[PDB]
Each structure stands twice: as C-alpha cells, then as structure tokens.
Amino acid sequence: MVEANLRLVISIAKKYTNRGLQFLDLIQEGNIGLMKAVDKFEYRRGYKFSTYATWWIRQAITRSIADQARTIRIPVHM
DNA sequence: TAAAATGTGATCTAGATCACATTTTAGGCAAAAAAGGCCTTGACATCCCACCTCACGTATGCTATAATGTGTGCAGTCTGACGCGGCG
C-alpha cells in the first residue's frame, strides 16, 4: 500500500514545497500521514483510498511545517 | 649773646596706715539624681513566604467524491599549477 501511494505523498507534498522549509521533509512527513491512513482506512466505507490519506497526509505536513520550520516555535493557535 | 635753665618757699592733696571682725568661697571632696548607655516591653507596620488558583494557553486528534516521477529559475563559463584516476 505505502510503496504504491508514495506518488500521492510526493504529489501533494510538492504543492507545499514552496520555499517554506524544504522538499524531502514535506515528503517524509507525508509518508507519516500515509502510514496513518494505511493503519486507519476501511474498505467497508467503499470509498477511494486517495481521499482518506489525502486528508491524513495533509494534516501531517500541514502541522510539521508549523511545529518545525522556525528557529522560534510559534504554537498552532497563533 | 640768644635762648633755654634755675632759684622763692609756703600752701596745699590723692593714697597709705593699721589691728581686727566677718564673708565667702572656693576648690575640691562626697554625692543625689538625671540623662545617656544598657536592656526590656508593647504596639505597629510591613512585609517575606509561600501557598494556593482560576483563565488562558497549549499539546494533541480527525476531516472518507477524488486527486499519484522533480525540474524551475539560477550559473556564467577567471586561470595557471599540481595531484590523481583513468586512459591507451
């Protein structure tokens, strides 16, 4: 599953590899959200998988950029 | 020889005498008491300490139409010598 959907991970990743942090870190975090979605996904919902891990990936990257990527940590609320 | 010094002598005038009683008052010796030095007491004032203390802030979780191989805006190519790994 994971080795299959790596291209989803990288595709979504490089929408956000504008000069925020760096490519490969967005990619790696994307693989983390991917592994979550593989751990959680239900076939019985019968939907496509792409959407599910799209959400999960996007969460993971979207707050790893914010936790990291600065010398001064601004937490999520600000 | 000009100009300053020298005798008339009786009539006075501010202080000293002189023995003894009474003050004083030292000065200096004993000290009473008061006001510092010693401590205490009551009363205040201000805390240090810390002991709590709720609101706001913060660490973390999912969101099911679906979407799946970068690139990406740069460098302008300095150059002469010296090592080293191919390169026959």
CSV table of C-alpha atoms (C1' of nucleotides) in Angstrom, one decimal:
chain,number,residue,atom,x,y,z
A,1,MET,CA,0.0,0.0,0.0
A,2,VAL,CA,2.6,2.5,1.1
A,3,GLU,CA,5.1,1.8,-1.7
A,4,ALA,CA,2.1,2.2,-4.1
A,5,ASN,CA,0.8,5.6,-2.8
A,6,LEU,CA,4.2,7.2,-2.5
A,7,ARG,CA,3.4,9.2,-5.6
A,8,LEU,CA,0.3,10.6,-3.9
A,9,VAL,CA,2.5,11.5,-0.9
A,10,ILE,CA,5.0,13.3,-3.1
A,11,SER,CA,2.5,14.9,-5.4
A,12,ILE,CA,0.6,16.6,-2.5
A,13,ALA,CA,3.9,17.3,-0.8
A,14,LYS,CA,5.2,19.4,-3.7
A,15,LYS,CA,2.2,21.6,-3.8
A,16,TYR,CA,3.5,22.9,-0.5
A,17,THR,CA,7.2,22.8,-1.4
A,18,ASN,CA,7.2,26.5,-2.0
A,19,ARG,CA,10.1,27.9,0.0
A,20,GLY,CA,8.6,27.2,3.4
A,21,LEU,CA,11.0,24.5,4.7
A,22,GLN,CA,12.4,22.1,2.1
A,23,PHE,CA,11.2,19.3,-0.2
A,24,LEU,CA,12.3,16.0,1.4
A,25,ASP,CA,10.9,16.9,4.8
A,26,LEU,CA,7.5,17.6,3.4
A,27,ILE,CA,7.8,14.2,1.6
A,28,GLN,CA,8.8,12.3,4.7
A,29,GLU,CA,6.1,13.8,6.9
A,30,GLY,CA,3.7,12.9,4.0
A,31,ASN,CA,4.8,9.3,4.3
A,32,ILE,CA,4.0,9.5,8.0
A,33,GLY,CA,0.4,10.7,7.4
A,34,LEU,CA,0.3,8.0,4.7
A,35,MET,CA,1.2,5.3,7.2
A,36,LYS,CA,-1.5,6.5,9.5
A,37,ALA,CA,-4.1,6.4,6.7
A,38,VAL,CA,-3.0,2.8,5.9
A,39,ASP,CA,-3.4,2.0,9.6
A,40,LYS,CA,-6.9,3.5,9.7
A,41,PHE,CA,-8.6,3.0,6.3
A,42,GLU,CA,-11.8,1.0,6.0
A,43,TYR,CA,-12.7,-0.8,2.8
A,44,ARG,CA,-16.2,-1.1,4.1
A,45,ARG,CA,-16.8,2.6,3.6
A,46,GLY,CA,-16.2,1.6,0.0
A,47,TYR,CA,-14.7,4.9,-1.0
A,48,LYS,CA,-11.5,5.6,-2.8
A,49,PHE,CA,-8.3,5.5,-0.7
A,50,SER,CA,-6.8,8.6,-2.2
A,51,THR,CA,-9.2,10.9,-0.4
A,52,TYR,CA,-8.6,9.4,3.0
A,53,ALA,CA,-4.8,9.6,3.0
A,54,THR,CA,-5.1,12.9,1.2
A,55,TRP,CA,-6.7,14.2,4.4
A,56,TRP,CA,-4.2,12.4,6.7
A,57,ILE,CA,-1.0,13.4,4.7
A,58,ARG,CA,-2.2,16.9,4.5
A,59,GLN,CA,-2.7,17.1,8.3
A,60,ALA,CA,0.8,15.7,9.0
A,61,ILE,CA,2.7,18.0,6.6
A,62,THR,CA,0.4,20.9,7.4
A,63,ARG,CA,1.4,20.9,11.1
A,64,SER,CA,5.0,19.7,10.8
A,65,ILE,CA,5.7,22.8,8.8
A,66,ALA,CA,4.3,24.7,11.7
A,67,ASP,CA,5.8,22.8,14.7
A,68,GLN,CA,9.2,22.9,12.9
A,69,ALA,CA,10.5,25.2,10.2
A,70,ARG,CA,11.3,28.1,12.5
A,71,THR,CA,14.1,28.8,15.0
A,72,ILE,CA,11.3,30.2,17.3
A,73,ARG,CA,8.4,27.8,17.8
A,74,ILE,CA,5.1,29.6,17.3
A,75,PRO,CA,2.4,27.1,18.5
A,76,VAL,CA,-0.6,26.2,16.4
A,77,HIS,CA,-3.0,28.8,17.7
A,78,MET,CA,-1.0,31.9,16.7
B,1,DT,C1',74.9,136.9,73.1
B,2,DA,C1',70.2,134.5,72.1
B,3,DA,C1',67.6,131.4,74.2
B,4,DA,C1',66.8,127.9,77.4
B,5,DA,C1',67.7,126.5,82.5
B,6,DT,C1',67.4,127.8,87.6
B,7,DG,C1',66.0,129.5,92.4
B,8,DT,C1',61.2,131.6,96.5
B,9,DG,C1',59.1,128.6,99.9
B,10,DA,C1',54.7,128.4,101.9
B,11,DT,C1',50.4,126.0,100.8
B,12,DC,C1',48.3,122.5,99.9
B,13,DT,C1',46.2,117.0,98.1
B,14,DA,C1',45.2,111.8,96.5
B,15,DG,C1',46.6,107.5,98.9
B,16,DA,C1',48.7,104.7,102.7
B,17,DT,C1',48.3,103.2,107.8
B,18,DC,C1',46.9,100.0,110.8
B,19,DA,C1',44.5,96.0,114.1
B,20,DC,C1',40.7,93.1,113.9
B,21,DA,C1',35.7,91.1,112.9
B,22,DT,C1',33.1,88.9,109.4
B,23,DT,C1',32.3,86.8,104.3
B,24,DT,C1',33.0,83.6,101.2
B,25,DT,C1',34.2,80.8,98.8
B,26,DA,C1',36.4,78.3,97.0
B,27,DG,C1',38.1,74.0,95.3
B,28,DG,C1',37.5,70.2,95.9
B,29,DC,C1',35.6,66.3,98.2
B,30,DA,C1',31.2,63.2,99.0
B,31,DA,C1',27.1,62.6,96.2
B,32,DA,C1',21.9,62.9,94.6
B,33,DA,C1',19.8,62.4,90.9
B,34,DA,C1',19.2,62.7,85.7
B,35,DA,C1',20.4,61.7,81.4
B,36,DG,C1',22.9,58.8,78.4
B,37,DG,C1',24.4,53.8,77.8
B,38,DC,C1',22.5,49.0,78.7
B,39,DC,C1',18.5,46.2,78.3
B,40,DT,C1',13.2,45.3,78.1
B,41,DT,C1',8.2,45.8,76.8
B,42,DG,C1',4.0,46.9,74.0
B,43,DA,C1',2.4,48.2,69.9
B,44,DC,C1',2.5,48.7,65.0
B,45,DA,C1',3.8,48.1,60.0
B,46,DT,C1',5.3,45.7,56.7
B,47,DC,C1',6.3,42.7,54.9
B,48,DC,C1',8.6,37.6,53.1
B,49,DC,C1',6.9,33.3,52.1
B,50,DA,C1',4.6,30.6,50.1
B,51,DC,C1',0.5,28.6,49.3
B,52,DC,C1',-2.7,28.5,46.7
B,53,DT,C1',-5.6,29.5,41.9
B,54,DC,C1',-8.5,30.2,38.1
B,55,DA,C1',-8.2,31.6,32.8
B,56,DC,C1',-6.0,31.4,29.2
B,57,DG,C1',-2.9,28.9,26.7
B,58,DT,C1',-1.3,24.9,24.7
B,59,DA,C1',-0.4,19.7,23.2
B,60,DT,C1',-2.8,16.6,20.6
B,61,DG,C1',-6.8,14.1,17.1
B,62,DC,C1',-9.5,13.7,12.7
B,63,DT,C1',-11.6,15.6,8.1
B,64,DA,C1',-13.9,9.2,3.6
B,65,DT,C1',-16.1,12.3,-4.4
B,66,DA,C1',-11.5,12.4,-6.0
B,67,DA,C1',-6.7,13.7,-7.0
B,68,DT,C1',-0.5,9.6,-7.6
B,69,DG,C1',8.0,10.7,-11.2
B,70,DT,C1',11.3,16.9,-9.6
B,71,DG,C1',12.9,20.0,-12.6
B,72,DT,C1',12.1,25.7,-12.3
B,73,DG,C1',15.0,29.6,-12.4
B,74,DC,C1',19.8,30.2,-11.3
B,75,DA,C1',25.4,29.9,-13.1
B,76,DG,C1',28.1,32.3,-16.2
B,77,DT,C1',31.9,29.7,-18.1
B,78,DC,C1',38.8,33.5,-14.3
B,79,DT,C1',43.3,30.8,-14.6
B,80,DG,C1',47.7,28.6,-14.2
B,81,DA,C1',49.8,24.6,-11.5
B,82,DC,C1',49.6,20.5,-9.3
B,83,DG,C1',47.6,15.6,-7.9
B,84,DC,C1',45.4,11.8,-9.0
B,85,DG,C1',42.4,8.4,-11.7
B,86,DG,C1',41.6,6.9,-15.7
B,87,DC,C1',43.1,6.2,-20.4
B,88,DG,C1',45.9,4.0,-24.0
